[PDB]
Ligand binder design. Structure first.
Ligand SMILES: *[C@@H](CC(=O)OCC)[C@H](C[C@@H]1CCNC1=O)NC(=O)[C@H](Cc1ccccc1)NC(=O)[C@@H](Cc1ccccc1)NC(=O)CCOCC#C
Ligand SMILES: *[C@@H](CC(=O)OCC)[C@H](C[C@@H]1CCNC1=O)NC(=O)[C@H](Cc1ccccc1)NC(=O)[C@@H](Cc1ccccc1)NC(=O)CCOCC#C
Lengths: 302, 305
């Protein structure tokens, strides 16, 4: 029993974290096989960050301008190239601690673990969700760029995020491991912001199933609803529309609890329209939307 | 910016997790130097676990009854001892991945990272606090016993919890690595109630400081209270008394924000008496009490390990 914001164990990723320096700029890189991946703005200077021409800025660099430190051992760069918004530095040694891995591009509403690092050294691990507006609500300070987000399926690490920027509102933007930003953001020190965020409906429902599994049941009612009638109330409260694919994804949780998805939707509708009345669910006075159906099964199955 | 429930990196601990099997019972152990630590109830059978005499149960075992698996190598048990509620299996090989470590007994209100493990394989990491009633609000399933909790300081891992039990209310009870349970709980298959809990005041204040550092300021006010007047409200709302030691511990955060502790206390008093009026603080509609002042400093200053 119990339900926590649970990240994946971070060791397999800790073994791949390195420090990358160019000029006076230092940030984190991800060392997999004989390649180090890092944000390309490691080649910028303070004045240049406004409208940087990365093609030219990289022309002026040689392999020896890139200092890569794994612990207190220096790796020797023997090639460099740019892929979208990430730099790839080829080094002369493969990382012995390389795990089985893949690069994936995740969809809004999906979750991942972040290993926050500074100067190639890990500082902490936490769980995030790709918001519908393609930001993440992270915890990142100066020096954290190059920190990565990941999921672990068995012993395979699926890297899905590398950190680049903090938006004016305190949320965060970055790229997949092929250097493509999530959302309409660019690696420039310019006026940027995607406001107007929405709640991830299928995640709230999964979390309500988690509550039921854990014995919190006060919000269950006898009523039911249709998908169209639920979705009318949903968009009124800034919830993502619920689709049949979402309903199907919740099949396993519905089966474990005996509660059909549309019955849960009726409970959810009443919560949105009436509040919780000074009550809590799984220790929260808000409806949580950063647990996916898989996160719930993973943590209520082990 | 941003403020998350942040655990320590778990790699140093992952390297110490092993599987311990005794008969049909399998659970997790902690392999440090040439000793494997695990809950002593691994030696129980379904006909014993009610009111077991653990000394008799261990006299009746031998080294070969214990089956210890470190990844894909079998460790040879060469000795066994019991200290309080923790079993100590001496093995023939020292763990090459042993970090600098300490065994520490933590105080209610102190937080730690839990590495939830099954069959000796780490499964996830999350943050917990030792509650005032000496339970922890963990996330554990069958197979999780022997999972440990810990804090890190530079390179030293301070182990403070090993998991043994879930209470009927769904919260958890365990020992320190010296084998002494937190609270009045025992390793017997009996229902033992979590007593009434209280809110960790100093941690709530630390989290309000975290909010200020991250730009949430709406709960601040022009008032300052006295410690006495604050603690009158605290008792009524089932909050721990605030002590001068707590005020001192909050020093660094009061320094960074420029907001004195007793000034912050007047915000906490107002939130307790009037609630939050449909607003949130750091994404929460409740007052969070599982971040310590060090937790705030560590996260908002980028301390690494
Ligand atoms: C990682 C690298 C770094 O520290 O280099 C700078 C010395 C950080 C992580 C950020 C830092 C604060 N919290 C984080 O998560 N990344 C940055 O600092 C990027 C660096 C960058 C270089 C070249 C081209 C693009 C980005 N910049 C930012 O994070 C800025 C982005 C910004 C600035 C002004 C308007 C919109 C967006 N964010 C920032 O300064 C905080 C929020 O902006 C407030 C304002 C105005
Ligand atoms: C770890 C045991 C393990 O890994 O070994 C594998 C065989 C679990 C962790 C529990 C499991 C569910 N979630 C958890 O955190 N520990 C236990 O199962 C202990 C084992 C034990 C053996 C011998 C002596 C003491 C403890 N048992 C429990 O946790 C029971 C305690 C109990 C017994 C009788 C009535 C109430 C509580 N907890 C339990 O069953 C929780 C749900 O039932 C509540 C009721 C009623």
């Amino acid at each position: 029993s119990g339900f926590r914001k649970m990240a994946f164990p971070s060791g397999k990723v800790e073994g791949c974290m390195v420090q990358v320096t160019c000029g006076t700029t230092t940030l984190n890189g991800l060392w997999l096989d004989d390649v180090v991946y890092c944000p390309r703005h490691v080649i910028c200077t303070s004045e240049d960050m406004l409208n940087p021409n990365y093609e030219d800025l990289l022309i002026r660099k040689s392999n020896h301008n890139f200092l890569v430190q794994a612990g207190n051992v220096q790796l020797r760069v023997i090639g460099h190239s740019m892929q979208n918004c990430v730099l790839k530095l080829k080094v002369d040694t493969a990382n012995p601690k390389t795990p089985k891995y893949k690069f994936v591009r995740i969809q809004p509403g999906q979750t991942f673990s972040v290993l926050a690092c500074y100067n190639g050294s890990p500082s902490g691990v936490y769980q995030c969700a790709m918001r519908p507006n393609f930001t993440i609500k992270g915890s990142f300070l100066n020096g954290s760029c190059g920190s990565v987000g990941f999921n672990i399926d068995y012993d395979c690490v699926s890297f899905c995020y590398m950190h680049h920027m903090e938006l004016p509102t305190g949320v965060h933007a970055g790229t997949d491991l092929e250097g493509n930003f999530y959302g309409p953001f660019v690696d420039r020190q310019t006026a940027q912001a995607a406001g107007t965020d929405t709640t991830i409906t299928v995640n709230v429902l999964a979390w309500l199933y988690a509550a039921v599994i854990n014995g919190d049941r006060w919000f269950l009612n006898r009523f039911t609803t249709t998908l169209n009638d639920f979705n009318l109330v949903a968009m009124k409260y800034n919830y993502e529309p619920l689709t049949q694919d979402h309903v199907d994804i919740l099949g396993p949780l519905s089966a474990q609890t005996g509660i059909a998805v549309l019955d849960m939707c009726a409970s959810l509708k009443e919560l949105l329209q009436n509040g919780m009345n000074g009550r809590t669910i799984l220790g929260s006075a808000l409806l949580e939307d950063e647990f996916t159906p898989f996160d719930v099964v993973r943590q209520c199955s082990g």
